[PDB]
Amino acid sequence: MDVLAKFHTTVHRIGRIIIPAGTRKFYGIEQGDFVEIKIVKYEGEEPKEGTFTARVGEQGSVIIPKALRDVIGIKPGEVIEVLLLGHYKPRN
Protein backbone atom coordinates (compact mmCIF):
# COMPACT_ATOMS: atom_id res chain seq x y z
CA MET A 1 0.00 0.00 0.00
CA ASP A 2 1.04 3.68 0.23
CA VAL A 3 3.86 4.50 2.69
CA LEU A 4 4.69 7.94 4.16
CA ALA A 5 8.30 6.89 5.01
CA LYS A 6 10.46 3.72 5.04
CA PHE A 7 13.30 2.90 7.49
CA HIS A 8 14.98 -0.11 9.17
CA THR A 9 15.40 -0.70 12.93
CA THR A 10 15.91 -3.64 15.35
CA VAL A 11 13.72 -4.56 18.36
CA HIS A 12 14.98 -3.57 21.83
CA ARG A 13 13.73 -4.65 25.30
CA ILE A 14 9.97 -4.06 25.99
CA GLY A 15 9.44 -4.10 22.16
CA ARG A 16 10.65 -0.45 21.95
CA ILE A 17 12.39 0.90 18.81
CA ILE A 18 13.88 4.33 17.92
CA ILE A 19 13.40 6.00 14.52
CA PRO A 20 16.40 7.84 13.00
CA ALA A 21 16.13 11.61 13.49
CA GLY A 22 16.24 11.96 9.67
CA THR A 23 12.91 10.12 9.22
CA ARG A 24 11.28 12.07 12.13
CA LYS A 25 12.21 15.33 10.36
CA PHE A 26 10.90 14.30 6.91
CA TYR A 27 7.68 13.01 8.52
CA GLY A 28 7.11 16.12 10.74
CA ILE A 29 6.87 14.08 13.99
CA GLU A 30 6.88 15.75 17.42
CA GLN A 31 6.24 14.32 20.93
CA GLY A 32 2.51 13.84 21.62
CA ASP A 33 1.66 13.25 17.90
CA PHE A 34 0.18 9.93 16.71
CA VAL A 35 1.48 7.93 13.73
CA GLU A 36 0.22 4.64 12.21
CA ILE A 37 2.89 2.17 11.13
CA LYS A 38 3.44 -1.49 10.13
CA ILE A 39 6.49 -3.79 10.46
CA VAL A 40 7.55 -6.75 8.29
CA LYS A 41 10.24 -9.35 9.11
CA TYR A 42 10.95 -12.65 7.32
CA GLU A 43 11.53 -15.89 9.29
CA GLY A 44 12.11 -19.35 7.74
CA GLU A 45 9.87 -19.63 4.64
CA GLU A 46 7.03 -17.39 5.99
CA PRO A 47 6.91 -13.57 6.36
CA LYS A 48 5.54 -12.22 9.68
CA GLU A 49 3.82 -8.80 9.76
CA GLY A 50 2.10 -6.51 12.31
CA THR A 51 0.25 -3.16 12.09
CA PHE A 52 -0.61 -0.81 15.00
CA THR A 53 -0.96 2.86 16.06
CA ALA A 54 1.72 4.44 18.29
CA ARG A 55 2.34 7.81 19.98
CA VAL A 56 5.74 9.54 19.60
CA GLY A 57 7.65 9.65 22.91
CA GLU A 58 10.96 11.27 23.88
CA GLN A 59 13.92 10.72 21.50
CA GLY A 60 11.42 9.60 18.79
CA SER A 61 10.84 6.20 20.47
CA VAL A 62 7.75 4.11 19.60
CA ILE A 63 6.44 0.88 21.23
CA ILE A 64 5.08 -2.10 19.24
CA PRO A 65 2.25 -4.03 20.99
CA LYS A 66 3.58 -7.15 22.80
CA ALA A 67 0.73 -9.18 21.22
CA LEU A 68 2.27 -8.58 17.76
CA ARG A 69 5.84 -9.28 19.01
CA ASP A 70 4.87 -12.84 20.01
CA VAL A 71 2.81 -13.70 16.89
CA ILE A 72 5.62 -12.44 14.61
CA GLY A 73 8.36 -14.26 16.63
CA ILE A 74 10.53 -11.11 16.95
CA LYS A 75 13.56 -11.03 19.31
CA PRO A 76 15.94 -8.33 20.67
CA GLY A 77 18.72 -7.48 18.16
CA GLU A 78 16.72 -8.57 15.04
CA VAL A 79 16.26 -6.01 12.25
CA ILE A 80 12.86 -5.44 10.61
CA GLU A 81 11.77 -3.07 7.81
CA VAL A 82 9.20 -0.50 8.95
CA LEU A 83 6.63 1.26 6.73
CA LEU A 84 4.51 4.26 7.86
CA LEU A 85 0.83 4.00 6.85
CA GLY A 86 -0.75 7.25 8.16
CA HIS A 87 -0.63 10.05 10.79
CA TYR A 88 -3.01 11.84 13.22
CA LYS A 89 -2.56 15.28 14.84
CA PRO A 90 -4.32 16.97 17.82
CA ARG A 91 -7.26 19.23 16.86
CA ASN A 92 -8.34 22.49 18.56
Domains of the chain by residue range: 1-92
**89 three-class SS:** coil
Question: Cα–chain-centroid distance for residue 44?
Answer: 22
Which of 56, 21, 20, 22 has the alpha carbon at shortest distance from 37?
Answer: 56
Question: Cα–chain-centroid distance for residue 92?
Answer: 27
**60 three-class SS:** helix
Which of 89, 24, 14 has the alpha carbon at shortest distance from 58?
Answer: 24
Asked if residue 78 lies in contact with residue 72, where contact means CB atoms within 8 angstroms, the answer is: no
Provide the experimental method for this PDB entry: NMR
Which of 33, 92, 90 has the alpha carbon at shortest distance from 61?
Answer: 33
Structural element, H or E, at residue 46: strand 46-55
Torsion angle (degrees, nearest 10) of CA 65, 69, 74, 79: -20
**35 three-class SS:** strand
